[PDB]
């Protein structure tokens, strides 16, 4: 409960030498100012990847809960904010990869991961496991691929995960391999560099995921899909 002092209007407002005798001496707490700095940084972070305002509100809620619960005083507020943004994105059913939140933060993957682990421990809550499906609409749309390719990639990644073709591979890597090996089946083609730089995976990760997913090529595609390229014409790395 505080109010500001406006700009000077006349001679009485000013002092002998070019300065106003009343100034904006705010009475904010260190705590309120530090958490307002953090909300302002969260909004800047979220607008970088065009997150909707509801995710920002959820992130603010999680940040306030962590900052009142007071168990992570030693970690930078910007790392706690990044981890909160990751948790909020994951809770809404639209998760972002750790490297995606890293790209819009000064905080590394190491540090945001540790803060995420510690926030989950502190709040005594849990989050759903990411499926190679949620990371599909974005990783595709950004690569500019048709809608039939959306369905092909979603179905094929889901089927590959379902029958346990790929042991222990991260969902990002399986999703990216699905995008690669569903893109060549259509007219629109995408090289390794684009998919790697747009999904965060290295060339060696996508190459060995491709070589693992290749042998079960025809049984994994959807039945009703236009084979612009023959199944046997996919190039093996």
């Amino acid at each position: 409960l505080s109010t500001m002092i406006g700009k000077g209007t006349g001679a009485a407002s000013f002092d002998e030498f070019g300065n106003s005798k009343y100034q904006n001496r705010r009475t904010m707490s260190s705590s309120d100012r530090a958490m307002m700095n953090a909300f302002k940084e969260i909004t800047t972070m979220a607008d970088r990847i065009n997150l909707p305002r509801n995710i920002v509100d959820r992130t603010n809620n999680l940040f306030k809960q962590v900052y009142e619960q007071k168990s992570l005083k030693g970690r930078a507020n910007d790392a706690i904010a990044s981890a909160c943004l990751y948790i909020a994105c994951r809770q809404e059913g639209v998760p972002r990869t750790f490297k995606e939140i890293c790209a819009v933060s000064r905080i590394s993957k190491k540090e945001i991961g540790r803060c995420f682990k510690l926030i989950l421990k502190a709040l005594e809550t849990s989050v759903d496991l990411i499926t190679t499906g949620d990371f599909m609409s974005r990783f595709c749309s950004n690569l500019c691929l048709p809608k039939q390719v959306q369905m092909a990639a979603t179905h094929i990644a889901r089927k590959a995960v379902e029958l346990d073709l790929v042991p222990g591979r991260s969902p990002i890597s399986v999703a990216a391999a699905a995008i690669y090996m569903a893109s060549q089946a259509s007219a629109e083609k995408r090289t390794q560099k684009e998919i790697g730089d747009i999904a965060g995976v290295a060339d060696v990760t996508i190459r060995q995921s491709y070589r693992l997913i290749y042998p079960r090529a025809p049984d994994l595609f959807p039945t009703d899909f236009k084979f612009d390229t023959p199944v046997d014409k996919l190039p093996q790395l």
């Binding site: 490297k99 790209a103 965060g200």
Partner: protein, 222 residues
């Protein structure tokens, strides 16, 4: 005889020179000649009661410019010279002013259009993208500057705690070098842990309050 003296032999001789204003195309053509020696000729005819002046362009340079004379008494126009030897001399005084105009009227507007088009080559206006840009904010495990800073920090390492005598030796060199000091610069020079520096400085040094910037430490034992 002096460096700043202006030589006035030209004025004493009353040498009269001609000031001519020419468009850009003629000057550009003359420059393109690479100083071959000749670029054109000038024809001056005098009738019983009138004077005609014109410039004939060289046929080789291309692969009739009438001249108009103006008043001279409005201003005193002269010219001086400055050389690499810092010697100032006056070549002379302008006796007549000349204006060069193109004979062509309608077709010369095409050359004006070409000149305007050339002048509008480097001006920039915003473009339009068919597809939204997605190459930015690309996911990455860590930023380049961050990993560079950690590599530097782990190559250099932490500043190692030393014995009292050797840090005191740096302190001695310090207040031999300069009377007053700032805590940060002392830390940088000594390359010692900040708590250990404060512990070894409080025993001998004292903090003096100043009304100008901030309170600071004093290296003098007394």
């Amino acid at each position: 005889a002096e460096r700043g003296e202006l030589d006035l032999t030209g004025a004493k001789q009353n040498t009269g020179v001609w000031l001519v204003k020419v468009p850009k195309y003629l000057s550009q053509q003359w420059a393109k000649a690479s100083g071959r020696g000749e670029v054109g000729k000038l024809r001056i005819a005098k009738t019983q009661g009138r004077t005609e002046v014109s410039f004939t362009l060289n046929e080789d340079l291309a692969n009739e410019h009438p001249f108009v004379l103006q008043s001279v008494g409005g201003q005193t126009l002269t010219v001086f010279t400055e050389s690499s030897s810092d010697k100032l001399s006056l070549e002379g005084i302008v006796v007549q002013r000349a204006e060069c105009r193109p004979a062509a009227s309608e077709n010369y507007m095409r050359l004006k259009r070409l000149q305007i088009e050339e002048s509008s080559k480097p001006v920039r206006l915003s473009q339009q993208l068919d597809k939204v840009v997605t190459t930015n904010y690309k996911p990455v495990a860590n930023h380049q500057y961050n990993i560079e800073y950690e590599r530097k920090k782990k190559e250099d390492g932490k500043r190692a705690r030393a014995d009292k005598q050797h840090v005191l030796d740096m302190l001695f060199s310090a207040f031999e070098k300069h009377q007053y000091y700032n805590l940060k610069d002392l830390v940088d020079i000594t390359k010692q842990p900040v708590v250990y520096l404060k512990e070894i400085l409080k025993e001998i040094g004292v903090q003096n309050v100043k009304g100008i910037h901030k309170n600071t430490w004093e290296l003098k034992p007394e």
